[PDB]
Every structure is written in C-alpha cells, then in structure tokens.
Write a protein that binds this ligand. Structure first.
Ligand code: 1BR
Length: 255
C-alpha cells in the first residue's frame, strides 16, 4: 500500500512516536485528514526495517478501536500514513474534560479498548514496544489504540513477572490494561505518582494495589483487581474483560 508522495500534503507537527515526529497532513485519493509518522534516521536500513515492520504486519488490521494504517512511502523520507485522531491523546482529553465526561463515557472507553485488545490477540499480534503504547481519541464516543503520542520501560504499568523476569504474555497485557482502566476512571492520573520505579515491585509484593477511583463502580474496581492478580494464571482473559465491561456499561447507563 505504497502511496504517491504528491497525494500527501504534510502539515504541522502534532506529536511523536519512537522513531520521530508525527504530523498532521492531507491525503488526496479527496481531502482526507491523516496523521503521518516520520522517521529521523530512516536513511539507515536497520532503522528503516524496524520503523516499517508493524506497518507491514498490521496492514490488513481493521478494528474500530485501533488506529488504521492507510499506507506507506518507502523512499526517503520514509513515511507511514494513518488515520488522524482529531481529539488527541486520551490522557489529556480526560484531564480537560474532568468535570464534563459522564461515568458512562469512561466505561465506554474501557469497553472499546477491551474489544481492540481481544481482536489483536485474535490476530496473534504481540506488541513488544510497551513504552510506546497509547490511546488516542477519534471522537467523543470513540477511542483507539496507537503507538505514538499527540500534543524507558513503563515500570508503573507493568506486571510483576515483567518487572522481575521480563516475562511478557497476554496475561501481562491484561495487568497493564487493568492499570489503563484505573487511569481512565481517574480522569488521566498516572499510576504511582511520585513513587520511584524501584519501589513499585515492593508495593505490589506487599499486596498493595492502586486504590478504588472516586465514583468508580465497585464492580469495575473488582474487575481491575482481578487484572492485578499476582499469579498471571488467575487474571481474566480479554474475552472475559469485554463481556464484563459490557455488563458494567449497561448498568451505569441505567442509573
Ligand atoms: C491500552 N493499552 C494499549 C494501548 C496501545 C497499544 N498499542 C498497540 C498498537 C501498535 C501499533 C498501532 C499502529 C497501527 C498505530 C501502528 C496500533 C496499536 C497496546 C495496548 C495494550 C495494552 C495491553 N495490551 N496491549 C496490546 S494497554 O497498555 O492496556
């Protein structure tokens, strides 16, 4: 899915990914607003091969809650063309809308994300660059998984087996999603604020967990705590999370 460069009008810098700046632009095939990943060092084929890898691996992915890849330009400057999430990063969206988003919206986002994570697992996709993981906002009622920002290891988000042994499985992704859920219900507050990364594993191994967010339904906090089972085998699967989140969303909308 090689795009002709003259079909792309490169606009302003809107964020960053692991390899360089992300720009807004326009793609005429007309007037589709898109985001364009650029790559600082893609004159080197070693860098170029890594920059493009997931764009190729994820090319045929199509999920409402995952940023869609549109195309690539593999001549220097190498670019990846993808859908534009016009409302930016979910963390800042939640912060600026702290007193204006209903709890039902927060639960909707968690649910949407669970559907995306179940789908990726169904494609046997393993996402290894965990530091790059991010959630973007495409509309008031739609969030999407991405690997770049708009506007080091994430120890405070990681499963105990990942911190201790660098074991990474779907179960470790479930732990991290539990943390994501907590952040959403906290209007974008990061976990373990002010805590040294070094001291996180000690707290977990003392049985401590992130506390129930204000206004979070106890059923949803219960689900988060299951994601944070120390034993990865006792964590729920993404299928179960999706089912359970759907039930929780309905209940909140009925309040
Ligand atoms: C919510 N979590 C999460 C957020 C983002 C991602 N990114 C995977 C991805 C990589 C590349 C793209 C392209 C198409 C833009 C190139 C899209 C999505 C992953 C996750 C995640 C979590 C737990 N498991 N997984 C896979 S999370 O951190 O809770």
């Amino acid at each position: 899915y090689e795009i002709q460069r003259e079909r792309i009008e490169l606009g302003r810098c809107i964020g960053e990914g692991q390899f360089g700046d992300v720009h807004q632009g326009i793609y005429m095939s007309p007037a589709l607003a898109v985001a364009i990943k650029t790559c600082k060092n893609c004159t080197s084929d070693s860098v170029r091969e890594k920059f493009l890898q997931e764009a190729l691996t994820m090319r045929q992915f199509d999920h409402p809650h995952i940023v869609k890849l549109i195309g690539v330009i593999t001549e220097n400057p190498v670019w990846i063309i993808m859908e534009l999430c016009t409302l930016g990063e979910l963390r800042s969206f939640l912060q600026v809308r702290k007193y204006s988003l209903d709890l039902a919206s927060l639960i909707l986002y968690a649910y949407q994300l669970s559907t995306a994570l179940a789908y990726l697992e169904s494609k046997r996709f393993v996402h290894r660059d965990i530091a790059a993981r991010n959630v973007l906002v495409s509309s008031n009622d739609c969030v999407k998984l991405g690997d770049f920002g708009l506007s080091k290891l994430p120890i405070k988000w990681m499963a105990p087996e990942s911190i201790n042994f660098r074991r990474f499985t779907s179960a470790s992704d479930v732990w991290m999603f539990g943390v994501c859920m907590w952040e959403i219900l906290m209007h974008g507050v990061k976990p373990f604020q002010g805590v040294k990364n070094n001291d996180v594993i000690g707290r977990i191994e003392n049985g401590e967990r992130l506390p129930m967010p204000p206004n979070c339904p106890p059923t949803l906090y219960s689900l988060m705590t299951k994601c944070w089972a120390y034993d990865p085998s006792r964590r729920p699967r993404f299928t179960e999370l999706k089912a359970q989140l759907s039930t929780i969303l309905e209940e909140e909308k009925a309040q």
